[PDB]
Assembly symmetry: C2
Homo-oligomer: 287 residues x 2
């Protein structure tokens, strides 16, 4: 007996499901609008059903909120609305976290009971390069000590307080650094997806995942991810290949081995991708 139910892509495809599950134009545009262009078969066969799955939890939580508010008799102290539902997305640099999180962001927004869905990356709570350099941590960028954990906690806490205005700092891929004083403002969305290297990490104290309602870990073979990282580095010369590999071996792989991979059992749902980026195995915690 296992805590998970498993499906390979075959098994998963073989499932006859209710809801017809067809991609809508809004969905496409929604997605293209997030700067993402991923295969449609993947979106159809894997992400639509996943989204429906997740939507059942969100709708269950909204019903519970209202049934609980009814029982309590709709008092003053009780909030008027469910606080945002929070979804964590974890995994290695280059495994597709951001893509996975942007597709769910677009698909989940399609339902009328939860149309406002925000996406925050924890890259934004990285210490700025100067401060990392003040502390001799540039080479450990993305490791747990490279983030301002207190600020991350405060931001997610404020979101789970039902605050109307909660602000995250902004990481620039263009500069590879925090943009000083830029802010992403989150305004009581229905759903918040929080993507990052560290989102399921265990902090002796109180961790940010304590505030999650659902979490995903995006998985793949470590040698496949190394390839994906190299390709991404080449898109941003055998010399570039050499430089990519050095960053992988020195920074990103050890980060994966020591800090990220051990958090995989904590996820609600683990999605494993083969060499071609398509999902070949899903593990869902038993309800």
């Amino acid at each position: 007996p296992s805590p998970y139910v498993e499906f390979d892509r075959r098994q998963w495809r073989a499932l006859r499901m209710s809801t017809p599950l067809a991609l809508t134009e809004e969905e496409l545009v929604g997605l293209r609008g997030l700067g993402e262009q991923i295969d449609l078969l993947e979106v159809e066969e894997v992400y639509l059903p996943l989204a429906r799955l997740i939507h059942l939890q969100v709708a269950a939580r909204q019903r519970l909120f209202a049934a609980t508010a009814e029982f309590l008799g709709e008092p003053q102290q009780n909030p008027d609305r469910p606080v945002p539902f929070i979804i964590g997305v974890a995994g290695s640099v280059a495994v597709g976290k951001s893509t996975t999180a942007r597709v769910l962001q677009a698909l989940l927004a399609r339902w009328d009971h939860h149309p406002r869905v925000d996406l925050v990356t924890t890259d934004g709570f990285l210490y700025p390069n100067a401060e990392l350099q003040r502390r001799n941590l540039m080479h450990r960028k993305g490791f747990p000590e490279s983030y301002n954990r207190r600020a991350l906690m405060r931001f997610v806490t404020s979101v789970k307080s039902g605050s109307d205005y909660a602000c995250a700092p902004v990481y620039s891929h263009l500069h590879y650094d925090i943009i000083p004083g830029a802010e992403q403002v989150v305004r009581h969305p229905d759903i918040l997806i929080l993507e990052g290297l560290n989102v399921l990490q265990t902090g002796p104290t109180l961790m940010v995942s304590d505030l999650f309602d659902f979490s995903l870990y995006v998985d793949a073979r470590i040698e496949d991810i190394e390839q994906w990282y190299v390709s991404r580095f080449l898109a941003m010369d055998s010399q570039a290949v050499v430089a990519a590999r050095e960053i992988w071996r020195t920074i990103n792989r050890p980060n994966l081995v020591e800090n990220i991979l051990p958090t995989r059992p904590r996820a609600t749902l683990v999605l494993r991708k083969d060499a071609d980026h398509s999902i070949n195995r899903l593990r869902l915690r038993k309800l």
Copy 2:
């Protein structure tokens, strides 16, 4: 904005409500069978609506399992029924965890959609005093290292995996030691309540609390818990000296004053630093925090916002 809604006792009582699956006089008085300290007003003002709240989540979880099973189309891999809903209860030695847990256990079992409710204490996963002795941990009894974390984890995991059979060992508060050979068996209940000093503790990678669906922390001023710890140590003495099998224990022959000296000593050196160092910092991880007055009655509820 806090992540909690907070109510003092006046405000709780001032709330509207419903008194949902409400209790016969006999059913009420039956609850006195959980201990001599059961206060039925407390049970009716606080624990009952609390059980109703919890019952709402247990039932939402049950419908969610069914909606999810239908949507996936009832495949062979999906289980037949929802795995147990697990509730953790945490706090200091002598704050009332066990009583709170026992009351909740009885109230939750009233509902037909979940009548099988088990209660397991993590005291049973302490290493026996002899094993503690081999490990050099007798003076740290109840600290996280005094437990077989791995057997505890395997047991909760097994339950949350929907097994039909899991076993926990058993601690004797009278002989202050594990009972050789004794096991509590747990058989896929609707709800498992897990109670102990370490349940919300934060360890490496995986923690037992990752398997919880809801948790409570029972809270009070430290000064008062001492007083309750001292009182309970007196009562235990008295109880041991009356048992045929337990009057042989050194502590059974303490005088009131000697039992007070020894209780404050254990408090000072063990239970209190355990509380400050390891228990209290888990308080913010609880779904619900119940604070008790000097009189044992609840003066404050903090509930996580849904």
